[PDB]
Design a protein around this ligand. Structure first.
Ligand SMILES: *[C@@H]1O[C@H](CO)[C@@H](O[C@@H]2O[C@H](CO)[C@@H](O[C@@H]3O[C@H](CO)[C@@H](O)[C@H](O[C@H]4O[C@H](CO)[C@@H](O)[C@H](O)[C@@H]4O)[C@@H]3O)[C@H](O)[C@H]2NC(C)=O)[C@H](O)[C@H]1NC(C)=O
Ligand SMILES: *[C@@H]1O[C@H](CO)[C@@H](O[C@@H]2O[C@H](CO)[C@@H](O[C@@H]3O[C@H](CO)[C@@H](O)[C@H](O[C@H]4O[C@H](CO)[C@@H](O)[C@H](O)[C@@H]4O)[C@@H]3O)[C@H](O)[C@H]2NC(C)=O)[C@H](O)[C@H]1NC(C)=O
Ligand SMILES: CC(=O)NCCOc1cc(Br)ccc1C(=O)NCCCC[C@H](NC(=O)N[C@@H](CCC(=O)O)C(=O)O)C(=O)O
Ligand SMILES: CC(=O)NCCOc1cc(Br)ccc1C(=O)NCCCC[C@H](NC(=O)N[C@@H](CCC(=O)O)C(=O)O)C(=O)O
Ligand SMILES: *[C@@H]1O[C@H](CO)[C@@H](O[C@@H]2O[C@H](CO)[C@@H](O)[C@H](O)[C@H]2NC(C)=O)[C@H](O)[C@H]1NC(C)=O
Ligand SMILES: *[C@@H]1O[C@H](CO)[C@@H](O[C@@H]2O[C@H](CO)[C@@H](O)[C@H](O)[C@H]2NC(C)=O)[C@H](O)[C@H]1NC(C)=O
Ligand SMILES: *[C@@H]1O[C@H](CO)[C@@H](O[C@@H]2O[C@H](CO)[C@@H](O)[C@H](O)[C@H]2NC(C)=O)[C@H](O)[C@H]1NC(C)=O
Ligand SMILES: *[C@@H]1O[C@H](CO)[C@@H](O[C@@H]2O[C@H](CO)[C@@H](O)[C@H](O)[C@H]2NC(C)=O)[C@H](O)[C@H]1NC(C)=O
Ligand SMILES: *[C@@H]1O[C@H](CO)[C@@H](O[C@@H]2O[C@H](CO)[C@@H](O)[C@H](O)[C@H]2NC(C)=O)[C@H](O)[C@H]1NC(C)=O
Ligand SMILES: *[C@@H]1O[C@H](CO)[C@@H](O[C@@H]2O[C@H](CO)[C@@H](O)[C@H](O)[C@H]2NC(C)=O)[C@H](O)[C@H]1NC(C)=O
Ligand SMILES: *[C@@H]1O[C@H](CO)[C@@H](O)[C@H](O)[C@H]1NC(C)=O
Ligand SMILES: *[C@@H]1O[C@H](CO)[C@@H](O)[C@H](O)[C@H]1NC(C)=O
Ligand SMILES: *[C@@H]1O[C@H](CO)[C@@H](O)[C@H](O)[C@H]1NC(C)=O
Ligand SMILES: *[C@@H]1O[C@H](CO)[C@@H](O)[C@H](O)[C@H]1NC(C)=O
Ligand SMILES: *[C@@H]1O[C@H](CO)[C@@H](O)[C@H](O)[C@H]1NC(C)=O
Ligand SMILES: *[C@@H]1O[C@H](CO)[C@@H](O)[C@H](O)[C@H]1NC(C)=O
Ligand SMILES: [Ca+2]
Ligand SMILES: [Ca+2]
Ligand SMILES: [Cl-]
Ligand SMILES: [Cl-]
Ligand SMILES: [Zn+2]
Ligand SMILES: [Zn+2]
Ligand SMILES: [Zn+2]
Ligand SMILES: [Zn+2]
Lengths: 689, 689
C-alpha cells in the first residue's frame, strides 16, 4: 500500500544525521557564495529524489554585513580618549573549526554606522514595561544615553525600537547567564551552555511583515523600483551591537546611579545591576563608545522551490517550507529543520518513483535570508500571492527541529488542532519511559494544556519565522512543530554545530525522526485526505476564549466602558453565530453525498477559505502586512502571538492616553472590525445559495 | 428545450412597459417610505416569480436632503443687501403630476450649509484644464470667489473638487442648452428636451469607491462604528447648488471682467460668457449669495437580493444588479433598467417553475441609494466581500436601459468581448432598416470600433454606477449594456417620466426588449456555459494597446526619460508574456479532456480569477478602494475609465512638478507595479503545477 504508513516508515534517523552533517561543515550566510552552492546542491538532489520540477527563485534584497577591514567593537573610554577596554572582535571558534574562514563575527544586522559615546543606562530586557518602570516610576531619562540590555523575553528588534523611542543614542545587547546558562551544565564544547565569549547574532529590524526593506508589497525582482534607504521599512536609527557575558561584565561592573528596582532586574553575573546613568564616582568621567561600520547592501538570494504535482487537485498547494541560510554553521538553526525536510522529500520521492502521487500538489521550499527578516519567503509570496490566495491549502514551517529534548511543541491555527491530535496518537513516542506509548500520550503527559484535561498544549502562532507571510498576510492555514525543553543557550552563536546536536541534543536522531514524522505526516494528510483535515469547530472554541480574554482586559476600566458605551455584545454575538454555523457545516460535511466531487470541492473550498476569511485587506493600524484579524505578532514582542490584536493594542496602556474619548472610540472601532470579520468568516460556512 | 432561446422568447416588451409604468407613478427617493414600499413589492414579486429566496438587506448610511421649511436658493444681492433676484424653489411639475407630493426640489446632495456671498467667476465645465487655463494662462484667481459652471463633460463631484482646490467659496451648477437642448426638438412635455426651468439633481461627493462616507471598508450595519462628519470620506467643504438655464441666464448676463478665452467656453444662451470676476461696471457692486440649508442624515436603505440556486455549481455567483432609488420619478434613471431586470427575473422564474436550474447560482439585486454614491451596492459588497472574492464569476449592471434610440452601447471587461459579439450575432436588430438583420450587424454598422474593421465599439468601464465595487474594488469581471444616441437632456430632472419614455424614446418597448435580451443573454451564458465564456486573449490585445498608449504619453518627455532612465521594457515584456501564456491557455481550454470535472473546475477557476489577478491589495495612491491596476475611474472624471491609471496619474501634468526627480521616480515605480501585476495575472493562466 501507498499510504501514510508507507511514507512514514521510509523516513530514517540515519538519513537525517547524514544530511545534518552535510549541511553544517561550512557557514551558509545569506547572500554568500557558499549558500548559493548549497542551494544548487539542494536543487540537484530534490530532482534526483524524484520531484517533478525544482527551480531556484532569486531576488535582490537589502542585506547587512560587517566591514571585514574595519571591525565593530565597543570601548570604555577615559577622560583623555584612551580606550582602556575593548570588547572582542570574534567568538573563539570551536574545536576543529579554528581554521574555518568566512565565519561572520558577531554583529546586529542592519545597524546603522556610528561611533556614539556616552553614559550607560541598564534597561533590563528592554521590554515596554522595563522602560515604563524606568521612565514612569524611577524617573530615569534615556535620552542621549547608550542603553545596555540583556537578551531574552522578547524579539531583539522590539528592544531596539523601544530604546530608540526612549531617545537612546545606541544599544548594546548581551547574553546574561541567568537567561543563557542552564544550572549544572557545562559550556560548549563540554556541554550545551553558552561560554563567556559566545555571542548571539541577529537582525534588529521592525519590518511588521514587509519583507525586503526596499520593496514592500512587491517582489524584489530584476526590474523592481526600490525605495531610498531613508524611506526603507524597519531600519533602526541608532547603532547596535551584541556581546558576550565576559565583555558585558566589564561594562556593567562599574555602573552607578540608582540601584536596580527589584530582583527581576538582576541577572547572575557578579555585578550590582545598577541602572545608571553612568558609572560610580571614581570612574564617573569614563564613557562607553561604540564603533559600528557595518554596511547595508543589495544582495542576491536564492530560494529553492520543489514541486510534486497532485494527481486529482494539482491546483491546490500544500507547502512545506523552511530556511537554509544560517548565521554560521546552523547546527540547530536551521539545518536541523532543513535535514528533516530533505528526508521528507526523499520519502515522498520514493513513493512517487513507485507510481504514487499525492491528491493535491505539494510544494517544498528552501528559503533564503530568513535570518535577515524572513526575506526569501516574503519575496516569493509577494511574487506568487495570487496563486497562493486562491490555491493555498496550508503551510507547514520547518526551521529548527529541536530546541530541547523533553517533548513536542506545536504552534498552529486552530484549524489543525484535530489533525495534530489524530496524527500524534498514531505516532510512537521517542521518549525514555514511554516505549510503546503514542507521542500523544507522552506529549500530553509532559505538556498538558492549561484548558482541557487529557489534551496537550498547542500554542498560537507568533512570528519570527517564515510562516508569517503565509499566515498573517495571506491567511493560509499554518502550523509548525519541534522538540522542545521543559531559548537554547547557543542560539545564533558559532558554537551551534553538528557536534552540539550529535553529542548533547539528539545522538540517536530519534527526536529529529519524530519531528519529521509530525511535519511529514501533517503534509501527507493535508495533501491526501479527500476532505481537508480542518475542523472549523476548533476555531469556534478558541474564538470564545479570546473574546472572554479581551473583554476581561477592557473590564479593568468599568467606568470608561460606561462613559463611552463600550460594548462587546457584537463580538460575542458573532462568536455565537460562528459556533452555530460551524456546527451545522460539520454535520453537512459528515452527511454530504460522498460521491459528488463538486459538492466535495465546494466544501473543501469552504474549509480552505476559512482561514482566508479572517484577513482584512485594510490590515491592522500602521501595520498593513498584518492582515489577520484574530492573530498578529505582538506589537511588543514579534515572537509572541496576540489574539484580537486590533482591540488589544487599542486597549494597551489606555489609561495614559491624553484624549480618552478618542482612545475609547478606537477601542469600539476595533470591536466593530473584529465582530464583523468573525461574522463574515462564519458566513463563508453557510450554505452557499 | 430549456435553453437560451427559451429564456429569450419568454421576455415580452409589453411586460417591461407594464413594469415601467408601475415603478414610475410616484417618487422613490432613497431613504423615503415610498422606496421601502417598492422594495417590499419587488421582494414579494420576485418570490412569486419563482426565485428560491428573496431577502432585504438594509444598512444605515449617510444621506442628504433639503430642509422642507428652509429652502435652498441663490440671489443677486445689491449694495444694501436687498435680494433683487431669486432662483426658483422647485421645477414646474409636468402635466398631470402637479399634485404629486414629496417631489424633492433640486439640490446638490451632500452640500454643506452656508450663505456665502461674493463675486462670480465663470469656469466653463470646471474641468481640470478649464482651471489650468483660468489660473495659468488668464491669471484669474478663484480664491474667495463663487464659481459658476456648466454641467457636462465630467462628473459633477470632480467639478466641485476642482473648484474647491482653486479656493472657491461656493459652486453653482447649471444646465446650458448647448449641452442639454438638442437642435430642432421641443421641450418636455412636447419633446425630450430640457425646459428652462428644468434642473439636474445629483450628488457631489468624491468617494473614490468608499461607499457610505462614514464606514469605509466595512458594512454600515447595526453595530457599525462611524466616523465623525469631519473625518467622513468625500464630502465637499463649500456649498453647491444646481439651477436651470432661465436662472443661469439671469446670473450670467451681467458678467464682466475678461472675455471668454475662446469659443469652446461659450454656450448657447444670449450672454457674453465673460469669466469675471464679478459683474460689469454699473452692477459691479451687486454680489451673488447662496443659501443652502440641506442636512446630512444617517438613514436606512434597503437592497433586495434574490437568489436562484445553481444545480451544478451553486457556489459560483453570476450577479445581475441595478438600482431602484430615483431622484424623482426615475422614468429612465433607473426604472427603465429595473423594469428590464424584473422581466428577466420573471423569465428565469418561468423556466425554473418548469424544473430548470441554471448551472451556476444567479443573484439578482435591486440596489438602494445608488444616487447618493453607489451606497447600497458598496455596503452589501463590503458585507459579503469574502463570498464575492472567492465565488464571483461576473457582474452585469442594469441601470437605465436607454439614453437614446440609435444603437447599442456596451462597456465591459475585455473578458466579455467575445461573449458580447457572439450573443449579439444571435439577436435581432430592433432598428428601422435592419429588419431581419442581427443586432451585431446594426450595432457594427452604426458604432464601428475605431480599431477593427467589421467589429463594433466596446468601451472600457468607467464609473458612476453600481459595478464600481465589483469591478474596481473586488476584481469581478463586469459589464453593462444599453441603447444609446448617435447625456440625455432630462437626466435627473422631474421631467424624466414614464411618458417621456413611452412618447419619445421607445413607444414599442423594442429597445428595452433588445436590452433585456443582451443583459439577460449575458447572464444566461455566464450562468450556464460549461466553460466560462471569457476569452483571456482579448485582454492580451487591449493590454498592448494600453501599453502603447501610456508609453506614448511618456515619450512627450524624451529628455526626462533619458535623464531618469525611464523604461517601459518591463511592461511590454509582461504584456508579451501575458499574450503567449494566454494563447497556450486557450489551446488547453480547447483541447482539455472534456469529461473531467476537476480539470473543468480548475480551468473555470483560472478564468474566474483572471480579472481578480489585476487587483493590488494596496490600491492606487490615495485611493485604497480603486485596486484594479489596469482600470480606474479617471482622477479628473469619475464617469470615464482610465487605463494604467497609476502610470497615467504619475505622468499627468508632470512638467509642473517642482521636484522632477521625485515625480519621474514615481512614474518608474508605477511602471514596476503595472509590469509586475500583468506578469502575475499571466502566471495565473500557466499550468498550475
Ligand atoms: C448573529 O446572528 C443573528 C441572527 O440569527 C443576527 O441577528 C440579526 O440581528 C440584527 C440586529 O443586530 C437584526 O437587525 C434588525 O433587523 C430588523 C429587520 O429584520 C430591523 O427592524 C431592526 O432595526 C430596528 O430595531 C433596531 C434595534 O433596536 C433599531 O436600532 C433600528 O433603528 C430599527 O428600529 C434591526 O436592524 C437582524 O434582523 C437579525 N437577523 C436575523 C435573521 O435574525 C446577528 O446580527 C448576528 N450577529 C452579528 C454580529 O452579525
Ligand atoms: C517574461 O518572461 C520571460 C521568460 O520567458 C522572463 O525572462 C526572465 O527574465 C529575467 C530577467 O528579467 C531573467 O533573469 C535573469 O536570471 C538569470 C538566472 O536565470 C540571472 O543570472 C540574471 O541576472 C544576471 O544578469 C542580469 C541581467 O543583466 C544582471 O542584472 C544580474 O546582476 C546578473 O548578472 C537575471 O536575473 C530570467 O532568467 C528569465 N527567466 C526565464 C525562464 O527566461 C521575463 O522576466 C518575463 N517578464 C516579466 C516582466 O516578468
Ligand atoms: C531565544 C530567545 O531570545 N527567545 C526570546 C523569547 O521567545 C518567545 C517568547 C514568547 Br512570549 C513566545 C514565543 C517565543 C519563541 O517561540 N521564541 C523562539 C526564539 C527562536 C527564534 C527562531 N527564529 C529566528 O531566529 N528567526 C530570526 C529572524 C526573525 C525575523 O526577522 O522576523 C530571528 O529571530 O533573529 C525560531 O523561530 O526558531
Ligand atoms: C449626462 C452627463 O452629465 N454626462 C457627462 C459625461 O459622461 C461621460 C463622459 C465620458 Br469621457 C465617458 C463616459 C460618460 C458617461 O458614460 N456618462 C453617463 C452619464 C450618466 C450617469 C448615470 N449614472 C448616475 O447618474 N449615477 C449617479 C451617482 C454616481 C456616483 O455617485 O458615483 C450620478 O452620476 O449622479 C448612468 O451611469 O447611467
Ligand atoms: C554534501 O553532499 C553532496 C552530495 O552527496 C556532496 O556533493 C557532491 O560532491 C561531489 C564532489 O566531491 C560530486 O561528485 C557531486 O557532484 C556532488 N553532488 C552534488 C549534488 O552537489 C558534497 O560534497 C557534500 N558536502 C560535504 C561537506 O560533505
Ligand atoms: C582598543 O582598540 C583601539 C583601536 O585599535 C586601541 O587604540 C589604538 O591603539 C594604537 C596604539 O597602539 C593607536 O595608534 C591608535 O591611535 C588607537 N586608536 C584609538 C581609536 O584609540 C586601544 O589601544 C585598544 N585598547 C586596549 C585596552 O586594548
Ligand atoms: C480525528 O479523529 C476523529 C475520530 O476518528 C475523527 O472524528 C470522526 O470522524 C468520523 C468520520 O467523519 C465520524 O463519523 C466520527 O463520528 C468522528 N468521531 C468523532 C468523535 O468525532 C475526526 O474527524 C478526525 N479529525 C480530522 C481532522 O480528521
Ligand atoms: C404596482 O403593481 C403592484 C402589484 O401588481 C400593485 O401592488 C398590489 O397592490 C394591491 C393593492 O391595490 C394589492 O392587492 C397587492 O397586494 C399589491 N401587491 C404587491 C406585491 O404589492 C401596485 O399597486 C402597483 N402600483 C401602481 C402604481 O400601479
Ligand atoms: C428673494 O427672497 C427673499 C427671501 O424670501 C426676499 O426677501 C425677503 O422679503 C421680505 C419682504 O417681503 C422680508 O421681510 C425679508 O426680510 C426678506 N429676506 C431677505 C433675506 O432679504 C426677496 O424679496 C426676494 N426677492 C425677490 C426679487 O423676489
Ligand atoms: C464565440 O464564437 C466562436 C465561433 O463559434 C467561438 O470560437 C469557436 O469555439 C469552438 C469551440 O471551442 C472552437 O472549436 C472553434 O474553433 C472556435 N472558432 C473560432 C473562430 O475561434 C468562441 O469560443 C465564442 N466565444 C465565446 C466566449 O464563447
Ligand atoms: C570598510 O572599511 C575600510 C577601511 O577602514 C574602508 O576603506 C571601506 O570603504 C569600508 N568598506 C565598505 C564596504 O564600506
Ligand atoms: C529627557 O532628557 C532630555 C535632556 O536633554 C530632554 O530633552 C527630555 O525632555 C527629557 N524628558 C523628560 C521626560 O524628562
Ligand atoms: C537530554 O535529556 C536529558 C534527560 O533529561 C537532560 O537532562 C539533558 O539536559 C537533555 N539535553 C538537552 C540539550 O537539553
Ligand atoms: C430646517 O429649518 C427650520 C426652519 O427655519 C429649522 O427650525 C430646522 O431646524 C431645520 N431642520 C433641520 C433638519 O435642520
Ligand atoms: C489668489 O488669491 C488670494 C487673495 O486673497 C491669495 O491669498 C492667493 O495667494 C492668490 N494666489 C495667486 C496664485 O495669485
Ligand atoms: C427616436 O428616433 C428618431 C429617428 O432617428 C430620432 O430622430 C429621435 O430623435 C429618436 N428619439 C430620441 C429621444 O432620441
Ligand atoms: Ca518586496
Ligand atoms: Ca461602509
Ligand atoms: Cl519551525
Ligand atoms: Cl447600466
Ligand atoms: Zn531559523
Ligand atoms: Zn535564526
Ligand atoms: Zn441610475
Ligand atoms: Zn442617476
Amino acid at each position: 500500500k501507498h499510504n501514510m504508513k508507507a511514507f512514514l516508515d521510509e523516513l530514517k534517523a540515519e538519513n537525517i544525521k547524514k544530511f545534518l552533517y552535510n549541511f553544517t561543515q561550512i557557514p551558509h550566510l545569506a547572500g554568500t557564495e557558499q549558500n548559493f552552492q548549497l542551494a544548487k546542491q539542494i536543487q540537484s538532489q530534490w530532482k534526483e529524489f524524484g520531484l517533478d520540477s525544482v527551480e531556484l527563485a532569486h531576488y535582490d534584497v537589502l542585506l547587512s554585513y560587517p566591514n571585514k577591514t574595519h571591525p565593530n567593537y565597543i570601548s570604555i573610554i577615559n577622560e583623555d580618549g584612551n580606550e582602556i577596554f575593548n570588547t572582542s572582535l570574534f567568538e573563539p571558534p570551536p574545536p576543529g573549526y579554528e581554521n574555518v574562514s568566512d565565519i561572520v563575527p558577531p554583529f546586529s544586522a542592519f545597524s546603522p554606522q556610528g561611533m556614539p559615546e556616552g553614559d550607560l543606562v541598564y534597561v533590563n530586557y528592554a521590554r515596554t514595561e522595563d522602560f515604563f518602570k524606568l521612565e514612569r516610576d524611577m524617573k530615569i531619562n534615556c535620552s542621549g544615553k547608550i542603553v545596555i540590555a540583556r537578551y531574552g523575553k522578547v524579539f531583539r528588534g522590539n528592544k531596539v525600537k523601544n530604546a530608540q523611542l526612549a531617545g537612546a543614542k545606541g544599544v548594546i545587547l548581551y547574553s546574561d547567564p541567568a537567561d543563557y546558562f542552564a544550572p549544572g551544565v557545562k559550556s560548549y564544547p563540554d556541554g550545551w551552555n553558552l561560554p563567556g565569549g559566545g555571542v548571539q547574532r541577529g537582525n534588529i529590524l521592525n519590518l511588521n511583515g514587509a519583507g525586503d526593506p526596499l520593496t514592500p508589497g512587491y517582489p524584489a525582482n530584476e526590474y523592481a523600483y526600490r525605495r531610498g534607504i531613508a524611506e526603507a521599512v524597519g531600519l533602526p536609527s541608532i547603532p547596535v551591537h551584541p556581546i558576550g557575558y565576559y565583555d558585558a561584565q566589564k561594562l556593567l561592573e562599574k555602573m552607578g546611579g540608582s540601584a536596580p528596582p527589584d530582583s527581576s532586574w538582576r541577572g547572575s553575573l557578579k555585578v550590582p545591576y545598577n541602572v545608571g546613568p553612568g558609572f560610580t564616582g571614581n570612574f564617573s568621567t569614563q564613557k562607553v563608545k561604540m564603533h559600528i561600520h557595518s554596511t547595508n547592501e543589495v544582495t542576491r538570494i536564492y530560494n529553492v522551490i520543489g514541486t510534486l504535482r497532485g494527481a486529482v487537485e494539482p491546483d491546490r498547494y500544500v507547502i512545506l517550507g523552511g530556511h537554509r541560510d544560517s548565521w554560521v554553521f546552523g547546527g540547530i538553526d536551521p539545518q536541523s529543520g532543513a535535514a528533516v525536510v530533505h528526508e521528507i522529500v526523499r520519502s515522498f520521492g520514493t513513493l512517487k518513483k513507485e507510481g504514487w502521487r499525492p491528491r493535491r500538489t505539494i510544494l517544498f521550499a528552501s528559503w533564503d535570508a530568513e535570518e535577515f527578516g524572513l526575506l526569501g519567503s516574503t519575496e516569493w509570496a509577494e511574487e506568487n500571492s495570487r496563486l497562493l490566495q486562491e490555491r493555498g491549502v496550508a503551510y507547514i514551517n520547518a526551521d529548527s527541529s529541536i530546541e530541547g529534548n523533553y517533548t513536542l511543541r506545536v504552534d498552529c491555527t486552530p484549524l489543525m488542532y484535530s489533525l495534530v491530535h489524530n496524527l500524534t496518537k498514531e505516532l510512537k513516542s521517542p521518549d525514555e519511559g514511554f516505549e510503546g506509548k503514542s507521542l500523544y500520550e507522552s506529549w500530553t503527559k509532559k505538556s498538558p494544556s492549561p484548558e482541557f484535561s487529557g489534551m496537550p498544549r498547542i500554542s498560537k502562532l507568533g512570528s519570527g519565522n517564515d510562516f508569517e507571510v503565509f499566515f498573517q498576510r495571506l491567511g493560509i492555514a499554518s502550523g509548525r512543530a519541534r522538540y522542545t525543553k521543559n531559548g537554547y543557550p547557543l542560539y545564533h552563536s558559532v558554537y551551534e554545530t553538528y557536534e552540539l546536536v550529535e553529542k548533547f541534543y539528539d545522538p540517536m536522531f530519534k527526536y529529529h525522526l519524530t519531528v519529521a514524522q509530525v511535519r511529514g505526516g501533517m503534509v501527507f494528510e493535508l495533501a491526501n485526505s479527500i476532505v481537508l483535515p480542518f475542523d472549523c469547530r476548533d476555531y469556534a472554541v478558541v474564538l470564545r476564549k479570546y473574546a472572554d480574554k479581551i473583554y476581561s482586559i477592557s473590564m479593568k476600566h468599568p467606568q470608561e466602558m460606561k462613559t463611552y458605551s463600550v460594548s462587546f455584545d457584537s463580538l460575542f454575538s458573532a462568536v455565537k453565530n460562528f459556533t452555530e454555523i460551524a456546527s451545522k457545516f460539520s454535520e453537512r460535511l459528515q452527511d454530504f453525498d460522498k460521491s459528488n466531487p463538486i459538492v466535495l470541492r465546494m466544501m473543501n473550498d469552504q474549509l480552505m477559505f476559512l482561514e482566508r476569511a479572517f484577513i482584512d485587506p485594510l490590515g491592522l493600524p500602521d501595520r498593513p502586512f498584518y492582515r489577520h484579524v484574530i492573530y498578529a505578532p505582538s506589537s511588543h514582542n514579534k515572537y509572541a502571538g496576540e489574539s484580537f490584536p486590533g482591540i488589544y493594542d487599542a486597549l494597551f496602556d489606555i489609561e495614559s492616553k491624553v484624549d480618552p474619548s478618542k482612545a475609547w472610540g478606537e477601542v469600539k472601532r476595533q470591536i466593530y472590525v473584529a465582530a464583523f470579520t468573525v461574522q463574515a468568516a462564519a458566513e463563508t460556512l453557510s450554505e452557499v445559495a
